[model samples]
Target chain A: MTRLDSVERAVADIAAGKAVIVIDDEDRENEGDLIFAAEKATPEMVAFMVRYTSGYLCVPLDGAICDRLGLLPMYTVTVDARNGIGTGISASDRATTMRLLADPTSVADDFTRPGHVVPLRAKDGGVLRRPGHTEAAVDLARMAGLQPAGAICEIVSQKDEGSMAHTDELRVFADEHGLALITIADLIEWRRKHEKHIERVAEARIPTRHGEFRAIGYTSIYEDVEHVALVRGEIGDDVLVRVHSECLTGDVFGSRRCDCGPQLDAALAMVAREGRGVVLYMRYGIGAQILVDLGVRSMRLLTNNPADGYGLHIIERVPL
Target chain B: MTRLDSVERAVADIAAGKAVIVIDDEDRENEGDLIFAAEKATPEMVAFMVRYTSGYLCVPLDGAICDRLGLLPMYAYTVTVDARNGIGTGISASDRATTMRLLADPTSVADDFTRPGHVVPLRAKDGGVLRRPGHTEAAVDLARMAGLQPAGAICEIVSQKDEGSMAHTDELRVFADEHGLALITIADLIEWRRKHEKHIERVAEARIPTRHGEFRAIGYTSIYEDVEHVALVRGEIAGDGDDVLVRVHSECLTGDVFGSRRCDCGPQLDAALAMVAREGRGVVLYMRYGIGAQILVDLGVRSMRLLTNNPDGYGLHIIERVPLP
Candidate 1:
């Protein structure tokens, strides 16, 4: 059982459709969480996870993927006095529930007041921390070289009788479910050993209503996604930056329903007029973390999103 | 007050926005409900109606309009103990209530319910007392005030006259003839609502998040009716699945959010979600006064094994029933 204490075994087990128990560092809050590639997840796998915890399951995604996919945080709403833990909004009607689940990234209870659900956006740091158990799952996801997306289930070692962990019981359960049992330290150590390599693939001149700017594209050694920087004037510290999502209808077709096109135009005009700015197109994902690759530390941002507390500081938010 | 005895005078009073007490026949409940053209209703008028009855204000719409607006009697989402007697799904949320009030072009009260095709808006059935049961003659007079228009004016009865002493059939006839006030029945008001039912148009749509999950919400509005509607869906609800969870939620304020255990609304809502969530997918069409069959047909849901406590959907191919919690 202890023979393969290496990365190959870890990757091989996951690739061959097996689940692994990934542990966190000793200093972390949670004991650990179970991780599995989303692509490899089966109903049986899900069932085992659901049964083991008798709780909800979480799918953790990288910050960039989250931004790219437009995934909003799940919110829980109720008329109840308090939005207690583990409580989601009550369905206004039967069909409303189905509609909500149809879109994985859509928020339920969008207009609910005293809403309980607080969506943690991709721009926030340690978003994986509040949920407590997903850190290992997220880490395992990145380490396993799977898509920046992974499924997570909380593991409890101790509990009030009836749910207390029994190693023997887990062994049989794991065997029946065809899952692999592993520790967090092993996966973390492997990830530490591995490193990310990023390079500028190309830069081109593009002219638009915002301004004539240089578009520089970047590719990461670890993942298939790409990132681009739309730079106007000289790009440097304390410059203006707008991290905008792509709206095909409003951005291209000029739909009047939203101010996406106008907002973008406004942002571009500001950047051009200001003589220095960058519009990071998150075609792949918002890799604000990757901004350091371009030597950007602080900038004037154009966003009302709270996710700005990451990667760089926004010296000012210029209203459009 | 009885000097001018002409239809024009009555029409002038109504157009001038004055609310006259409405009456009903002796055999009817609460003698008669108040009648006022909803289109001409003002805050002052609504205040008077509230004060006159101290009863829950009910807006009974026309039956045809009920069909057009998709306003169905809201049922308990689960196995409710009672499905009768004035308890309907009321539109309680402040936003919805405000919208409905706006649609009715009036203010709101509480304990609201729906009687199939009729909508006694702006009042709850259980909480408020029916202060004055009016007469049929007063309804006719109020109708005259509304320029003989069948819709808009809410026909709620007002006045402090003792039963049997107020206005009798003979006296009502003399009054109608002398004062030039037109007379009508409850059926007349309902028929007016039906004739005037607004054909709502789909305004916009978007994916919204609720406690239930991500669902597509489509907004609908009827200009003539001056009302709005929203239909919600979660998964791929189509015609193939026979057992689809469909609930007709009548909007109720007291039971749903106010936690008034008087009705089974909130509990039924809870059960419907629990069952649908377990089933993986289903459809729930909610209305302040609401329906599901036409909504189902619109959503490509041709047939269904309904989960309900009411036997209202007669026209649809109701294959079976899964008695809800």
Candidate 2:
């Protein structure tokens, strides 16, 4: 299966309260971690994780949740559930503490000082902002419609217990345990593909020196930025498209510092001469997203830049 | 100063038996290394490198040199060695200098040094920087360009504030400035070599008649690799101004020879030739799986109206681009 499919399966497993293996890049700390939604933790599952992986379990929660639950940094004097039955050292008690941490109604008073289960704070933007095991686990939990909290532990090798499992060992362990395997890179790409980064804000007929065209404006959902797409005719499959970056000095004042103005004029002139094309005047990747919003399935892309096709079906490249 | 000037200065420093800082790409290691010619290595220099940089020093030599010395790979290493005449355990700066000098010696044999020593020798690829643009290859290339023994002693520069971390560009720049050492990136060296090195030479010339007009077809052979290239000249272009239209087309066997519809290469070549013929003064350098700019440079074509959809001129002064239909 493809990596995205594996990620989808991992998300499903997270929703089902099953553990999944998440590996990092080979160049990085090449190790796999067993991760599951914190709300779905059970004493048996905790015991299984402790037996197969590192006994030290970490509960990664959103920064806001950490703040609300009074969970400080690792430099925190570990805390435990206040009303736990026994000394908060057993798997059952740790599992209970994790569940309580994921519980939205649970307040700061619900947990006591010096807890066995460690609570790690995830970045605000989850995996998008920081591609770490903590962030990936929390992202998976959030995507699975559970509380943005995950229980994770590093998986150690069966042959060499002192060493952490590599990708090969992780894959074997995943197959033996029937757990879905994904990677931090996979999660980052999956999030980039699934996230709605741009939205259409405004559009109107704009008349220019070259010709009259329909101008559509888009706003970046994350950044305070705007993009525009000038359309001459109906957009369809295999349409002519030009994705251009905005150069204020060159496009507005005809500055000779760069070829942005000439390239923009060339794109517009080419589209005008074709009588049916689009000239997306905006930032880089957002323009590709805007093309998708305009229902452009395939296109004759007009560019001199040698970049990836942005997963678009590019029929040809018409250089300006 | 330009990056080329910095690289040239670094080359000069290497020639003068001085240490230069070589940095790799930020996306890769993002670290800098203190590199110098192995033949010129001194005990004091080695001690300075060990004190300021990561103590683990590596000597990178060309593959041919490694094979000649019977240096087999043990993680790109031969058996660890110390000079046969060395007194210490091979870890001291003086012992390491002895080992480095022996490694770079022309008449030194594999048996000249004892095995299981402290010094680690790395085997660089044959193509140097162009094949694999790593710190190892960069170091060896710098030594070779400096007219040394084509062997370099390199050690990773460690950050002063955090000894566990490798030195970054900012720290490396500061250290270089403080030490009055030249600093250059692998990219800078690659660009400098591409501009300075002569890779191709014209071997033969012939006049051929085409559909558009009569042209002079010249054959060129690569000096470094097994590849032949052709150049089609319509008229006098050597002494002409920057108005000569030129096309540096990469040979496409399936598209150009078999008329395959899978790509636009066939049509692009035809259109380029047609445009050049129409212009009455142009050159079309058909490259056979090699870099095109080098051939243009070899042909004494300084500037031209490049016929390409891609705007990267490869350091050539492109007056304009004549886009193919």
Candidate 3:
């Protein structure tokens, strides 16, 4: 997320949904059935993941489970983590594993789904993750699967979250019985009912040498300062945009046919380098494929953010 | 990045259209002026960036900045007894630079166009972020920018947050403007906005169980012993759906799963397990994720029962509208 994500990112991970870690004792203040949802490992659900799995505190199931689940070299994308690289988080609880894998829209992309989870009730595997892995990448069935879940029998497995997480997620009844369970649909519908928890706010004040000095909170302070002064000029609406395309020939082959990547890249760079305005990935036409904006957006790929088949081409271009 | 990332071939570099991370002090906070956008860098802007560098921070940026902007690999992600590999928890401010990068965003996602930021009386470039690439990558400028626009003022820099970051970023902008013409735009990062899930450090709960069961004065059971239950079952007109279920289990070291009580699992787990077996249809679950109030649930412990949650991050929030999932 961009500056818009200051508050949220302040409390969450800004990376590939894993950087921010969390741990909890399980919140039962509301419903008892939250266990099921927690098992499912939904983004909304809170988990106690292993941050640094090493030494003795490591996980119990590393290389073995990957082998057992056919997660050999690893699961490919579009498959479950268990089958793919076996990257995503999981628990030894068979139930949690089932729920997590059964979940189709658990991840932000919802592309990779875990196929199987061998929730170990006891400590049979290694304590931490195997070697050649990143920090905390352990195979402790005991903690995630067997030990953690079993020890805390009622605690269902879920994605790990740091203790600072605003609200702990526990699906009291995120789903229902089989026979074409309407629960998934109903849960998705109720997602709107999911109200954000109390915001965790922090304020910061600075005494810069620029002016007399000032103070502001983290959330609205930055923008507020901009707005107050923007009144002095004919500054247009603060709109941000990005262009996601790959130009094999034009971009790489020195074809000035279009300033596609260059244009948008310049725009965003300007905003960030200055830290006040917006950024735009130049919305360019297909000039034989172009790679821009990393990959979040691509040619002919316009979402509601822009909203249209040719979202790359806006109806009217406005100036800032 | 980990084995899974390597195995799956996940990329660690920045993506296309990723927003440029500038301190609020640029007075502009505009995305267009980025070095990649400008095509070339000036010693002036570089000096400004270094001058205004704020506390070390990690900011995802556009690709060209690294490939073309002339950024060098300062440090690699290494295991340290210092900073946390994830969020900057328990990590020293000094080591923050070692874990982050200032390269450009490689993915082609659009920059965010969410909204304008606060402006302060400061110039970001002056922060000397350029000379100190490490500082900029660490989001040193994250808090130092400003937004200024006085009537007669030819150019005014501002802070994205408040004065807290204005001085840092303002210095950078002024430095750049005076020296190098920092090309810029008044736009936003597309993909960077419209999202959820932030990465941050949640406050730490007392490592040791602080269940002040000390109220031996408190009549019968201690706060740790008592089990609280609530029914989330939904009921419509017609009649009570056969969904009517009851659960009971033996003492579970795990907690929360069995009953609605928030506590270490051991004490009340038996109740849930036993209830399920005794009444059928019900299931015996345990609380696994939590600290499980081991010492408190059992006997003698330093349970100040002070297990008060200071509600810190987004993942774990205070019981507001949605208590359970």
When summed lDDT is taken over every stretch of 10 residues in candidate 2 chain A, the lowest stretch is: A248-257
Docking class of 1: incorrect
Q: Quote the lDDT for A181 in model 2.
A: 81
> Could you give the DockQ of candidate 2?
0.01
- Candidate 1 lDDT by residue in tens digits, A1-320: 22113445656766665667643332323244566655555546655555565344555555654444344533342211122222333322211321222224433232233332222232222222222334445455455656545566555543434553444444444555556655544443344335444568788676554447777777755545456677877555797888877553344323455677577667767788887878776641235545655667887778876532234666887666
Model 2: per-residue Cα lDDT over A1-320, one tens digit each: 22322688899999998989887543333788899999998999888889887789899999878877656633655667899648987889988988998998888778887778888888766765567899988999999999999999999898677788777777778888888888876776677688866678887666565667777878866545567788888876889998777653345323354567678878878898988898887644456667877878788988766542234688988786
Listed in order, the DockQ scores are 0.01, 0.01, 0.01
State what share of the real interface contacts each candidate retains.
0.00, 0.00, 0.00
Backbone clash total for model 2 is: 5
TM-score of 1: 0.27
Q: In model 3, which regions exceed 4 Å deviation? A: A1-96, A101-320, B1-48, B52-58, B62-102, B105-177, B183-325
How far is A173's C-alpha from truth in model 3 (Å)? 23
Error of 2 at B96 (Å): 1.4
What does the lDDT read for residue B75 in candidate 3? 11
Per lDDT, what order, best first? Answer: 2, 1, 3
TM-score, each model?
A: 0.27, 0.46, 0.19
Model 1 complex DockQ against the native: 0.01
Q: Which sections of candidate 1 miss by over 4 Å? A: A1-52, A55-152, A156-199, A207-211, A219-228, A233-236, A307-310, A313-317, B1-325
